[PDB]
Design a protein around this ligand. Structure first.
Ligand SMILES: Cc1nc(Nc2ncc(C(=O)Nc3c(C)cccc3Cl)s2)cc(N2CCN(CCO)CC2)n1
Ligand SMILES: [Ca+2]
Length: 282
């Protein structure tokens, strides 16, 4: 049975039961009871973007990656059903609690993010859009990497020399292994800083000026380094290496002392508990 289901009717198994919010609908599974975040997109030429996105998710069965629960194309509308992550995105949590994550909370996220990235890169899949907004939480206090839109669009492009300039050679070399997957390692680093300080580095600047600033400036560091362990700072130092040639893998970073001793998700379970209690304040 293929990954996009033509034969079955989505309404048979799934029923919409609210909104989250182009749109994002909450959907109940009538057989199992399981909850899902649903997307019912009407398009019918470039829905192959979504099909490749679905085939990425289906291949990436991992604890720390969002689960594909089902994909159906049924008279004009494409249904993508993804496991419901009741904690929401980490950036939303920071907004609700009006603060950044603590270090033990960041250590868990980092550790679990590295396990997911080590897995994705094993499959020659690159996320290419890591940020706190794409790290979703469960109530047990585990992450789920979400939103493989950018990953899929990039993959579709790749799916479908004596005179070449050096800059062009470098940008076709950065498109293949073992350089392409290093982009996620840099983005992890920035995501960690975002979790420490709520906003990412260069947030004062507008997006056009930001690209130059990332190109021209030295790697970002933590604003108030006294608040953080030398292990966190050292982790950032090596992860935010501007040269992708010397920038370490996820596999290598899993052995760094900032994450190697992490054995419990407790700090994150607490975070999600605090955030959910905060939502109840009214
Ligand atoms: C926006 C949102 N999503 C939540 N969970 C998700 N699980 C999985 C998601 C996902 O895979 N989405 C997705 C899809 C489906 C397609 C393409 C691309 C993407 Cl990114 S989204 C929870 C949530 N909550 C409401 C608000 N808070 C409670 C009261 O305040 C917290 C809970 N809100
Ligand atoms: Ca924001």
């Amino acid at each position: 049975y293929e990954h996009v289901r033509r034969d079955l009717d989505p309404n048979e198994v799934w029923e919409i039961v609210g909104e989250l919010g182009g749109k994002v609908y909450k959907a109940k599974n009538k057989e199992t009871g399981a909850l899902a975040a649903a997307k019912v997109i009407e398009t019918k030429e470039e829905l192959e973007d979504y099909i490749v996105e679905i085939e990425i998710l289906a291949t990436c069965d991992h604890p720390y990656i969002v689960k594909l629960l089902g994909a159906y194309y049924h008279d004009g509308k494409l249904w993508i059903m993804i496991e419901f992550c009741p904690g929401g995105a980490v950036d939303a949590i920071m907004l609700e609690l009006d603060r950044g994550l603590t270090e033990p909370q960041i250590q868990v996220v980092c550790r679990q993010m590295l396990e997911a990235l080590n897995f994705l890169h094993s499959k020659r899949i690159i996320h290419r859009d890591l940020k706190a907004g794409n790290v979703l939480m469960t109530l047990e206090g585990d992450i789920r990497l979400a939103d493989f839109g950018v990953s899929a669009k990039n993959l579709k492009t790749l799916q479908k020399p004596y005179w070449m300039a050096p800059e062009v050679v470098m940008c076709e070399t950065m498109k293949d292994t073992p350089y392409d997957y290093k982009a996620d390692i840099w983005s992890l680093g920035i995501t960690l800083i975002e979790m420490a300080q709520i906003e990412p580095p260069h947030h004062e600047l507008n997006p056009m000026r930001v690209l130059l600033k990332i190109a021209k400036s030295d790697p970002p560091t933590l604003l108030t380094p006294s608040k953080w362990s030398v292990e966190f700072r050292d982790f950032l130092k090596i992860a935010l290496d501007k040269n992708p040639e010397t920038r370490p893998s996820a596999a290598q970073l899993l052995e760094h002392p900032f994450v190697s001793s992490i054995t419990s998700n407790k700090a994150l379970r607490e975070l999600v508990a605090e955030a959910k209690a905060e939502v109840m304040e009214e």
